[PDB]
Amino acid sequence: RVKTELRSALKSTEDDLGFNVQGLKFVKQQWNLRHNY
Amino acid sequence: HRDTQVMRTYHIQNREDYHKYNRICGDIRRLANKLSLLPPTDPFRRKHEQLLLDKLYAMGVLTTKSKISDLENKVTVSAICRRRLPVIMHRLKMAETIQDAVKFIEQGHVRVGPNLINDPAYLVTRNMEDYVTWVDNSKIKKTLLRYRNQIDDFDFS
Amino acid sequence: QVDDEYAATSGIMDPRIIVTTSRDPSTRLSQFAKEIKLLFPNAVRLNRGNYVMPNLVDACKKSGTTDLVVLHEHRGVPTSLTISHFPHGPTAQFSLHNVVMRHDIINAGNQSEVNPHLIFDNFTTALGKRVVCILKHLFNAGPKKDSERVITFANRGDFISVRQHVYVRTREGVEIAEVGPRFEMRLFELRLGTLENKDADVEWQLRRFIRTANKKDYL
Amino acid sequence: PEGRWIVSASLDSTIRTWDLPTGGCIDGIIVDNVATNVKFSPNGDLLATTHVTGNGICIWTNRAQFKTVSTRTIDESEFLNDIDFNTYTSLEQIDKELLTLSIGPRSKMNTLLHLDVIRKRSKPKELPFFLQLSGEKVGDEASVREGIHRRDQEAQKKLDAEEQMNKFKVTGRLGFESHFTKQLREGSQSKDYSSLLATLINFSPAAVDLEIRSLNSFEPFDEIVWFIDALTQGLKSNKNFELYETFMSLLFKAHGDVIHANNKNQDIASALQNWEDVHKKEDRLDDLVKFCMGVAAFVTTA
Amino acid sequence: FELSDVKSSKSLAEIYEDDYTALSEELQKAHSEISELYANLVYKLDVLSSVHFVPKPASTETPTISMEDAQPLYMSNASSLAPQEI
Amino acid sequence: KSDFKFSNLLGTVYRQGNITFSDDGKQLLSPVGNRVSVFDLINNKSFTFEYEHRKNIAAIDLNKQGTLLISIDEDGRAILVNFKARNVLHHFNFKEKCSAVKFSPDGRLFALASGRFLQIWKTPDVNKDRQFAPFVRHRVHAGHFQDITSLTWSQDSRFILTTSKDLSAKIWSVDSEEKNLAATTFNGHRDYVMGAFFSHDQEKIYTVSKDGAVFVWEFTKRKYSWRITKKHFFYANQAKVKCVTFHPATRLLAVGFTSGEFRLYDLPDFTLIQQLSMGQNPVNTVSVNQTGEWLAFGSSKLGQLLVYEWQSESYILKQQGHFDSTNSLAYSPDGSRVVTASEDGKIKVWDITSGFCLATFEEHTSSVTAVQFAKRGQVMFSSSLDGTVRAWDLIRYRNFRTFTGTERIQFNCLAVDPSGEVVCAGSLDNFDIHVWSVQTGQLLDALSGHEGPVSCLSFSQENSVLASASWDKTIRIWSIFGRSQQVEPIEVYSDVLALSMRPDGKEVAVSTLKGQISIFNIEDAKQVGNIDCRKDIISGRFNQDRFTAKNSERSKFFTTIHYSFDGMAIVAGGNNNSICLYDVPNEVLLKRFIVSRNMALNGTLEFLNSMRPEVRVTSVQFSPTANAFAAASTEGLLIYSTNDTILFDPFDLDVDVTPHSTVEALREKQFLNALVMAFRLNEEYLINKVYEAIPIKEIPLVASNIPAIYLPRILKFIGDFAIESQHIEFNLIWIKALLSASGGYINEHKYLFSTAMRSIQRFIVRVAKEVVNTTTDNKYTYRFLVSTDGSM
RNA sequence: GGAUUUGGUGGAUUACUAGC
């Protein structure tokens, strides 16, 4: 009950990071071929 | 005959040795001159000869590093030709004369740190001037220790 | 302008000094070397016995110290004192007459030990400026503007009189009180070598036996 | 010299060659003159025998230094090629479950990864009869006070491309459809890409960036959906697990702009769900490495 | 700066062109001569000081390609900068 | 453990001679001064032949079949090595200086040009057994005003044409009957002709000259023979063609100039595709592959080899070797990363897996003396003679801080706190051990107390104690952490120039000037023992010497030492010709390695026949993987290894144990026995037979069954096998089982298992995590696309 | 019978394919 919760809690905050990493790269990249000379 | 006249006073192998220094000792002044033609408040120029006087004092061709006039006036070949190894063995009173020090270098009795040195014309840095000794177990470092009655053949001196 | 021996270090590096005692010290003066160890900062007290003056000098240039403080005594009353700057620097054999050790008085506490201000009075002579620049460099550089203990070196009547004081500043006046030793002090010879050397060049030497010996000052 | 043989000579006029692992003779030499001494070289090259008659020393050249030697007990006849030539080639793959890598160098993932950054860091670094001067530039301060080439550079930049095209005018004709797109096309029609993916292994890393960028992308999206279905059919075979995911990732740098804007198309997301239904199984090494890391850090340190 | 009495070789049209068009063009060529001479000095000076043979450091326009590439090269330039520093 | 072989030479990619691609073109071979190195572009691996070449390679010949490789030295010695065999089949001696040797397309005979004489010699069959006199010469041609500067071969062996330096060019057929077809020599060429080229059609002959003007010879009617049809001219302000390589099928011309500009032309259209300057120094030898995709240009002056592809603007491999020599060798915790210092001060990081440099560091203007790595992959500290020490990152390739002294002192050597807080350095000028903190770039303290300079400095990881090295013959062990500040001094007989710290943290290995290597304790001042190294050191007589090699005191000490990570062996190397492997308990050397056999270098020969650079090893370290120890030479960084394992090193054999018996166990299903029966032979192919055989369901049963004694040995085998093998999933279940079966035992014997832990956890970081992160990154991107709303 | 010193030649001192 200690280990499985701590895995499932950190992974739930590790999912929030990379879901925000891949999106904001995609926001940065999609501007970088729309408005880049 | 200035080149011969200082080849005798320091004992040089080839009479061309002098002008092998006097090409360097002239090349100091040619770098001194063009570094004098830069304007005085230039942080290149202020950095750059003090960068050089660090080296020409470590090698020991010039007596002080304060006077900037020495760099054209006291830089002589006879200044660079007395940081030669046999002169330094005569300065440190190792050999009796200056020809006799060439006789001991060529026979192989002198060394700098680990390795013995065999060219007579080894320039020696003022920093490296600490470390010249007689080569160990030599027949000339054995005779010195017999004079003070202080041999120790566990060293096989 | 600072002296030529002290010129390379002058403000840059802190001094580290050694207070050491003569030979088999009396227990009064072995206390009194500790007041010298406390009067300076960066001072350690190494008890001396069966050291020679070569191998205590030569094992100190090696380890690297600025200078050396050695004391002497008569029957518990300390009499003499030398400061000798190590990298072939000068030495100054001082005679010190009126001493009051700190351990005599009361258990009032313990000293401040913080960096002191100094007070040099009545040094006019060029030899007097030598004694300035050879005493001043025994303290760590750049004291704070509001450090609370001040060490006066006063020169009334050719006897350099040194006292240790603390001060606080009231609404009108400064009020002070005394801690630490009272000295009278008198230099009597000044070599250019260390106290090892004993044949170095004598910059100054107190001549006693001269028709005008009592007349001049700093002579 | 390596303890692998013993050569003994005896009064039966033979010279045998014993083999210490397998415990038997592998060569039997009947010499008519009996051999008194046999000595190898300390080097692995010469064998010297001395016989009973004759004066000199017979020197034998060792074929074992230039050729592998079978280890069979052939001596009884005169008088598992894994084991016989004592070398073992590895399996390509143990079982259908096990993930593998590609055969060959381990740099093929790394070079195929950052292919755009490396090329940007590999390249080298590098009037008019009537002069035109502004009023401020000349001695007209009063005119400047009341005063109120990028396009030319861009036009000049078009000229270099035009010049290179003019420079090369080869009349040689090269097939309209490249071998890749043709092998993609037969792969899709066949519905089996097993022959397609055998080509994608043997491309150079220089070819692969030129290839996956060269994918016909349009409203219908036929080539992209054909290519994803190659990679999903790759990971079902579990071979070359390193490379096929890098072929996957190289899409998203080259066409990740495209498949994002055409997300939730039912044709692309049919492939991508078929990707994710396959790609979920290969988390089982990411759950395997962390146990392999965190124990081995705990064991050696603590 | 000291004005030079000697007649300027450059004409009025020429001086304006220079204004119309490193630290200084003359001073850099002084710096470039004087470092080529110093590396010649270190070689000969270095050979006498050194107890082992030393090769000459140097032997003294189109695209230039660096023989050795500094840093990772494959890694992006942006990665080297720290997040805190942007 | 004992038998090492020369596995690899690292650094110095190109020294001198022709660079020729293989017929397949998969592997490119570059010739070093005394050896030939083969580079495989596809596998990114560098292989060097174990054979010495007695002087520097001047020419390289590769057979079209690839069975025979011939290298010609300046003396004219001929060495033939089969690429597959990697052994010298024959060593015939030529008697003059050789310029280039090219095998014929048929390969029946190889054309060789020496001076002004052209020779064709029948090539001995590789399959045929070795003979006393294999070399035979088919013919000799002496009709040249001057020796030919280049040799070119047609597809047929009938015509061989060599371009003379006089100006004239001659054509020679192979068979005597085809002499009447072509015997004419071209004339009127200006300057000198660098090379002569033949197109697929034999009607057109292409020639090049030193001036840079190119003339094409076309046969036509004025009964009519060999006019100049058209001239082609290359314009260079000061550049002159030095070496020219032409490929007939692709019609591509490679031109080498004194300036170093690289240009490409097509013979049919005479159009310049690209002009690039590889370096300021001129290209010496340029070669082209059959495909022509890869072109290799090497400059001898800069000693750098560069390969470029004409079709796509990407370089397969571009690198430059150290200009002089590598002063220090640094080994990272990961086996693959290697750091080498240089006299120039440029720092280049080599790779253990493939002999290429990932990056260079030009931060140090002065030469770098010592390069060391702290116990992390985060940074490496480099010591230089400039008087400043700069830390470097390997994630970002940048200085953190450049640590400097007070009064600007040179720094020889260096020591880094394993917990990377403190960097210590030592001089020749000052003899004070400066101590920097890693965070604050101030120097914390100037640890002093030596007479004479500090040679080396090292920190034992277990006790975090730094031991100084002095020329005063006294070894002083410092203790610098935590309110102690106590230094313990141990007297030594002669100047100690070598200091080695054992992994244990309890012993210190020294290399004094009397030759002798002593091994001290630390917690006590006494010594365990000393081992005597003055006799088993080979010393060279230099050319300018006046003493015998027996009684010179140049090289009989050791200027480096490094303990193995087992703590049982020392590898030492100095300014001598030899490297050693002393055993530490038994106190006897194991095997002595001669670094090089070159007359070109000075310190090689004990006896000359009846200044030049000295040959000496500078710094030696044993790798964590521990297969081989790299010694940094004059010729370049050597790597010795045991990755062959062609050696029968059995352990506990019974009469019952044969290779066949282990195979029988698999049929019997006794996995526990057939693994132990295969560990008794200690042969890798029986182990791979039984390691790959047994299934997943009895891996942990086998792991529990495996004895404690074989645990260190089995872990080492997994570490070397799993790096280049395709099985990630099967290998990791073993390392789960070995760790799972005895987690406490491995942890308890931390000292016992060091190489096994490092080797296993290079496999996990380098190849296993990157497969994970690509699996991880790909999964997140798919999640982002489905979760995100559709565009427009 | 024994010991010391020395003149001269030959063979080696890199790995053996014939002279013009």
Curated annotation (Swiss-Prot), chain B:
SMART domains: Ribosomal_S4 (SM01390), S4 (SM00363). One of its GO terms (cellular component) is small-subunit processome. PROSITE patterns: S4. The keyword Thylakoid does not apply. Its main location: nucleus. InterPro entries: Ribosomal_uS4 (IPR022801), Ribosomal_uS4_N (IPR001912), S4_RNA-bd (IPR002942), S4_RNA-bd_sf (IPR036986). Transmembrane segments: none annotated. GO terms for biological process: maturation of SSU-rRNA; ribosomal small subunit biogenesis; rRNA processing. It is found in: Nucleus, Nucleolus. CDD domains: S4. Gene3D superfamilies: RNA-binding S4 domain (3.10.290.10). Residues 83-149 form the S4 RNA-binding domain. Pfam families: Ribosomal_S4, S4. It comes from the Eukaryota. Keywords: Nucleus, Ribonucleoprotein, Ribosome biogenesis, RNA-binding, rRNA processing, rRNA-binding. GO terms for molecular function: RNA folding chaperone; rRNA binding; snoRNA binding. Required for the early cleavages at sites A0, A1 and A2 during 18S ribosomal pre-RNA processing. PANTHER family: 30S 40S RIBOSOMAL PROTEIN (PTHR11831), U3 SMALL NUCLEOLAR RIBONUCLEOPROTEIN PROTEIN IMP3 (PTHR11831:SF1). Belongs to the universal ribosomal protein uS4 family. Component of a heterotrimeric complex containing IMP3, IMP4 and MPP10. Interacts with MPP10. Component of the ribosomal small subunit (SSU) processome composed of at least 40 protein subunits and snoRNA U3. This is U3 small nucleolar ribonucleoprotein protein IMP3. It comes from Saccharomyces cerevisiae (strain ATCC 204508 / S288c). The lineage of its organism: Eukaryota, Fungi, Dikarya, Ascomycota, Saccharomycotina.
From Swiss-Prot, chain C:
Transmembrane segments: none annotated. It is found in: Nucleus, Nucleolus. It comes from the Eukaryota. One of its GO terms (molecular function) is snoRNA binding. GO terms for cellular component: 90S preribosome; Mpp10 complex; nucleolus; nucleoplasm; small-subunit processome. Residues 15-196 form the Brix domain. GO terms for biological process: maturation of SSU-rRNA; ribosomal small subunit biogenesis; rRNA processing. The keyword Cell cycle does not apply. Keywords: Nucleus, Ribonucleoprotein, Ribosome biogenesis, rRNA processing. Its main location: nucleus. Required for the early cleavages at sites A0, A1 and A2 during 18S ribosomal pre-RNA processing. Component of a heterotrimeric complex containing IMP3, IMP4 and MPP10. Interacts with MPP10. Component of the ribosomal small subunit (SSU) processome composed of at least 40 protein subunits and snoRNA U3. This is U3 small nucleolar ribonucleoprotein protein IMP4. It comes from Saccharomyces cerevisiae (strain ATCC 204508 / S288c). The lineage of its organism: Eukaryota, Fungi, Dikarya, Ascomycota, Saccharomycotina. The chain holds residues 72 to 290 of 290 of the full protein.
From Swiss-Prot, chain D:
The modification Phosphoserine is found at S143. It comes from the Eukaryota. Disulfide bonds: none annotated. It is found in: Nucleus, Nucleolus. WD repeats lie at residues 1-30, 32-70. Involved in nucleolar processing of pre-18S ribosomal RNA and ribosome assembly. Present with 2020 molecules/cell in log phase SD medium. The WD repeats are grouped into two tandem seven-bladed beta-propeller regions. Interacts with snoRNA U3. Interacts with MPP10. Interacts (via WD repeats) with UTP18. Component of the ribosomal small subunit (SSU) processome composed of at least 40 protein subunits and snoRNA U3. This is U3 small nucleolar RNA-associated protein 21. The gene is UTP21. The chain holds residues 595 to 939 of 939 of the full protein.
Curated annotation (Swiss-Prot), chain E:
It comes from the Eukaryota. It is found in: Nucleus, Nucleolus. Signal peptide: none annotated. Involved in nucleolar processing of pre-18S ribosomal RNA. Required for the early cleavages at sites A0, A1 and A2 during 18S ribosomal pre-RNA processing. Belongs to the MPP10 family. Component of a heterotrimeric complex containing IMP3, IMP4 and MPP10. Interacts with snoRNA U3. Component of the ribosomal small subunit (SSU) processome composed of at least 40 protein subunits and snoRNA U3. Interacts with the SSU processome subunits EMG1, IMP3, IMP4, KRR1, NOC4/UTP19, NOP1, RPS4A, RPS4B, RPS6A, RPS6B, RPS7A, RPS7B, RPS9A, RPS9B, RPS14A, RPS14B, UTP1-UTP18, UTP20-UTP22 and UTP25. This is U3 small nucleolar RNA-associated protein MPP10. It comes from Saccharomyces cerevisiae (strain ATCC 204508 / S288c). The chain holds residues 398 to 495 of 593 of the full protein.
